[PDB]
């Protein structure tokens, strides 16, 4: 169950002693960077975004792979090469989450042209996250994917603080009703309002991690959700009359 900042782990960490927590990848590259030089490390990437990165590519990819590549490489280059492209071709691509599961996803328009960078995906209202690639095609139910992500987050929330603990189930039920179309147009804005409610109001960032994917889902595919909502009337309102 996480603590609150302030205080910091460096000020007070494990057993009240100074402590710095680091990622495996950041630690591992250090001797190579020390041995081969910060100048050599800075030779790659754009400004403030130097170096290489390990990339995990999954989804509907012809050649899923965990590969090392230079930063700032375009998604299209990073996927068509070293991963065999999209199953069914690039034109069959629907959406891609470029930074794992906590960052907003990007549609085909945004993805084609954008690079894998911290300061490039951020301005696209997304994030590099863990630089993990998930690829979805046109035969995929994007709503089901986001609902399953929300269910995962609901099961993964620790429940220490009120907003996340009580809103994960609410978000899951909202998404589940959206999946069957048993929802209304204004309830989409209601969902966005709830996401704004949770975001930045909890103890840790897990609330943001759960709120962000649905935010981007709505922002980039609100047409799909409304189409589903109306379409349920063709299979639910026929008995109401």
């Amino acid at each position: 169950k996480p603590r609150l900042k302030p205080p910091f782990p460096a000020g007070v960490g494990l057993y009240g002693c100074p402590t710095t927590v680091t990622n495996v990848e950041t630690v591992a590259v250090s001797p190579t960077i020390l041995r081969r030089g910060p100048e050599w490390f800075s030779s790659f990437g754009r400004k403030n975004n130097a170096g290489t990165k390990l990339f995990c590519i999954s989804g509907h990819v012809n050649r899923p792979v965990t590969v090392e590549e230079e930063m700032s490489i375009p998604l299209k280059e990073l996927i068509e090469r070293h991963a065999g492209g999209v199953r069914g071709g690039w034109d069959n691509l629907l959406a891609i989450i470029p930074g794992g599961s906590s960052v907003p996803l990007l549609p085909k328009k945004i993805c084609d042209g954008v690079l894998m960078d911290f300061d490039a995906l951020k301005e696209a209202q997304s994030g590099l996250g863990t630089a993990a690639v998930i690829v979805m095609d046109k035969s995929t139910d994007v709503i089901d994917a986001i609902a399953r992500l929300s269910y995962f987050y609901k099961h993964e929330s620790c429940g220490q603080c009120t907003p996340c603990r009580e809103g994960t189930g609410w978000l899951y039920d909202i998404m589940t009703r959206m999946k069957k179309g048993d929802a209304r147009l204004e309830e989409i804005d209601m969902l966005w309002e709830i996401t704004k409610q949770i975001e930045g109001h909890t103890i840790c960032a897990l609330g943001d991690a759960a709120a962000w994917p649905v935010q981007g889902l709505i922002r980039h595919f609100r047409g799909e959700m409304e189409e589903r909502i109306k379409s349920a009337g063709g299979k639910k309102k026929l008995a109401a009359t």
Binding site: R184, L185, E186, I229, K230, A232, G233, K236, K237, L238, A239, A240
Partner: peptide, 14 residues
Amino acid sequence: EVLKRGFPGMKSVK
């Protein structure tokens, strides 16, 4: 109020 005045397959509150 949706549970009160709403009907099955209702698309909007209006």
